[PDB]
Structures are given as C-alpha cells and as structure tokens.
C-alpha cells in the first residue's frame, strides 16, 4: 500500500522535467531507477544522466541501453547517453524531490492523532 508513493511520484513528475520525460518515454523499472537517481542537466543537443556515484553499482549497461533507446525516442535523434559519476548535491534528482514530500505529511497525521483527545 504505497498509493501515496506513486501519487507522490506524480508531483515529482509535475515539478521535474526529467521525471516527466521518463514517464512519457514509459521506461520500465531498473532503467527508470537509473533515470530517477540522476539529475537533469540539458545542453543544446545533449542529455547526460549524472547518476549519484553514491549508487554507482546500480548503473549497468542493461539499463543504459534501454535508457539510450528511450532518450533517443525523446530527443528524436541519437543521443550519446552515458551514466557519469559526479556525486555533488547542488540540484535534486526526481527521486530525491519525492522523499521530503513522503514524510512531512505522515508527521502532520501523527500530530492530528495525538490531538484527537
């Protein structure tokens, strides 16, 4: 019963252009988690998925190839898609945005329960 987790992902998509783009490509799950744990820089003809080096072992070519075909479908032209390793936190990925949103709501619910009387 995450209901909330997929609903919450909809807000993440509604704010992050990359999360939105991935959902429009309609990736599966492994490859989605790669796109999800990476932050979207965008250049004139490039999209280079900087995945958190903190989860470097999740990035596998089996994901990258499916991600590449999908990014190619998005761009409409061949993107040289690689997953590259810079762990700097300066901007948030579509996965990272979601997590803050999951917890505060639960805390507010707990407060109302404590306040029932």
């Amino acid at each position: 019963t995450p209901e909330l987790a997929a609903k919450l992902a909809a807000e993440a998509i509604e704010r992050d252009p990359w999360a939105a783009q991935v959902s429009q490509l309609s990736l599966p799950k492994l490859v989605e988690q790669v796109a999800l744990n990476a932050w979207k820089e965008e250049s004139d003809n490039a999209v280079c998925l900087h995945l958190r080096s903190s989860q470097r072992h999740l990035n596998n070519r089996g994901a990258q190839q499916k991600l590449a075909e999908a990014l190619s479908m998005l761009k409409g032209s061949t993107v040289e898609l690689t997953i590259v390793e810079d762990d700097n936190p300066a901007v948030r990925t579509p996965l990272e945005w979601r997590q803050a949103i999951y917890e505060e709501k639960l805390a507010q619910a707990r407060e109302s329960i404590i306040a029932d009387n």
Partner: protein, 72 residues
C-alpha cells in the same frame, strides 16, 4: 472508520476493554486518517481480556487480529 465521536475514545471503547481485563495484551490502534496511517498506542492502563472479540463483533465494528507487537 474515520468518523468516530471522541466520547467513543473515552467511553464505549474504553468501557468494552475495562471490565474484561487479563493476560497483558497491548492495545494497538489504527486510526484511519485521510492523510496517513499513524499508530497511537493506547497503553492507558488496561490490558484487554481476550473475550472482547465476540463482544466487539456484537455491533457494527470488525476487528483484525494481527501479530502482537511485543513478541517480535
């Protein structure tokens, strides 16, 4: 259900438990909130006797029998 009076918290709910006490059973409470599910532990005092299922099922309320929290 979401809609419970308040008095139910301190009255009928409490009274069902109060006369039938035995065998230190923790009371766990699921308050279905619109926002989330939080667990408020009653642990006011009373540990319910087990005869309460039949009595509780008597009116309008279904309960579920979960693994006791203590054992795990």
């Amino acid at each position: 259900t979401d809609r419970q009076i308040d008095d139910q918290l301190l009255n009928r709910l409490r009274q069902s438990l109060e006369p039938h006490r035995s065998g230190t059973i923790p009371v766990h409470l699921y308050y279905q909130r619109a926002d989330a599910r939080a667990r408020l532990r009653f642990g006011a005092t009373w540990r319910v006797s087990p005869s309460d299922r039949l009595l509780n099922d008597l009116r309008g309320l279904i309960g579920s029998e979960q693994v006791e929290l203590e054992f795990d």
